[PDB]
Amino acid sequence: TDSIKTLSAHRSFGGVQHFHEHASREIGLPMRFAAYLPPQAEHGKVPALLYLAGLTCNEETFMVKAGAQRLAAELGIALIAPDTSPRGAHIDGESTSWDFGVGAGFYLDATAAPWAPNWRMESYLVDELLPLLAKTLPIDGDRIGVFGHSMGGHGALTLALRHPGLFKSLSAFAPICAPTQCPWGHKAFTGYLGADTTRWIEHDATVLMQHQPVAPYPAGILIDQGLADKFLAEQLHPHLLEDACRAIGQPLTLRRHEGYDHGYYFVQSFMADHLAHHAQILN
Numbered sequence: 046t047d048s049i050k051t052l053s054a055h056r057s058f059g060g061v062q063h064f065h066e067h068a069s070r071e072i073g074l075p076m077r078f079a080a081y082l083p084p085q086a087e088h089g090k091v092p093a094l095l096y097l098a099g100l101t102c103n104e105e106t107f108m109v110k111a112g113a114q115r116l117a118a119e120l121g122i123a124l125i126a127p128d129t130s131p132r133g134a135h136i137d138g139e140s141t142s143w144d145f146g147v148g149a150g151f152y153l154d155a156t157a158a159p160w161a162p163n164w165r166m167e168s169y170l171v172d173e174l175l176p177l178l179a180k181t182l183p184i185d186g187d188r189i190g191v192f193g194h195s196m197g198g199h200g201a202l203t204l205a206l207r208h209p210g211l212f213k214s215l216s217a218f219a220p221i222c223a224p225t226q227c228p229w230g231h232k233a234f235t236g237y238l239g240a241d242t243t244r245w246i247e248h249d250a251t252v253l254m255q256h257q258p259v260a261p262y263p264a265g266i267l268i269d270q271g272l273a274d275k276f277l278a279e280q281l282h283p284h285l286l287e288d289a290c291r292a293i294g295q296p297l298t299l300r301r302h303e304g305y306d307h308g309y310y311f312v313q314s315f316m317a318d319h320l321a322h323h324a325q326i327l328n
Contacts, residue, residue: 047180052077058118059084062108067177071169073162074134077104078127078174080182081114085121092188092327093123093178094320095170095212097197097204100229101148104128110309113316120324123184127174129196131163144229145236151224152200153248155237164237166200171208190214190323194312195276198268199224202250202286206261214326216267216319218312219274222286223251229280251282254289265296267322269315271305 052064060083069076085091094117098106107113107126117124130150136159139146146160155164179186191212193201198220205212224230225245238244246252254261270283277283283299290297305311 047177049177049181057081057114060086060114060118062114064104064108069169069173071165071173072131074131076128076131076169076174078125079104079108080126080178081108081117081124082183083118083121083123086123086183090183090185091121091123092190092324093125093182093184094214094323094327095125095127095175095189095191095201097152097191097193097200098126098129099193099195099197100129101143102129102194102197103148106309110313111316112313113320116317116320116324120320120328122320122324122327123182125174125178125189127170130166134163136160136163142232145232149196149233151196151230151233151237151248152204153237156244157237157239160237167204167207170204171211175211188213188327190216190327192216192218192319192323193220194218195221195281195307196229198222199230199250203248203253206250206253206257207247209261214264214323215262216322218268218315218319219270219277219281219307220250220268220283220286221281223249223282225249225252226282226285227280251285251289254286254295255292257293257295260290260293260295262295264326265298266290267319268297268299269311269318270299270301271307271311272301272303273305274307274311276307 150166198217
């Protein structure tokens with residue numbers, strides 16, 4: 046039904062890669078997001094995959110470095126990459142550290158000031174960007190999966206778990222699985238939510254997975270982790286999500302890969318495995 050602004054468009058494996066801007070009312074500022082449309086989207090409504098980037102990343106990171114366009118065109122799936130935070134809020138201290146503020150929204154709604162007005166990434170995706178994707182793009186809104194990297198794997202996990210039925214499939218590259226148990230999570234939660242811990246635990250993939258009444262993704266969750274990853278011991282803790290999904294019977298393929306690190310040469314190397322995993326469920 047609606048339009049939305051186009052910053053640039055490029056032909057890509059027969060499909061179209063788009064970059065968009067819109068005036069967000071959950072965030073109250075202009076927001077940027079990218080969208081890859083495969084060649085099959087000119088004849089019909091295709092399933093889309095939302096990709097959530099990590100710390101220091103924008104809505105352009107994944108579209109340039111992941112190499113997911115080639116397989117999306119072959120599988121007929123759209124790709125949606127939003128930003129990782131609000132931009133142009135000019136809040137004091139929003140850029141003093143790269144682990145907090147700008148490029149570090151943590152896919153949640155901040156309750157504390159000065160962040161609460163604009164740091165509403167969870168509501169922005171769920172109640173604004175995803176509905177708006179069905180209104181403006183050739184997407185089937187009821188066939189969307191989600192995946193992401195580090196801060197964005199924490200986001201794919203926690204958003205999938207907190208909005209049941211919203212995402213049909215689920216993947217992550219090197220996710221922060223237990224944000225309550227790592228410095229990145231302690232600092233961001235303290236900043237955005239303060240110290241209460243109840244708001245903290247409803248934003249922790251491991252805590253939420255422990256209390257599911259049934260396996261939320263019976264088709265299974267796929268997670269790739271490099272063993273040469275600088276942040277694995279301090280920040281990611283995938284062993285704890287492995288124990289949480291065992292406890293409740295959630296099938297998980299957590300794969301550990303010697304030699305691979307945190308960055309996009311790793312993400313590229315397993316992108317094919319994730320696109321196949323999601324295409325098979327959404328198709």
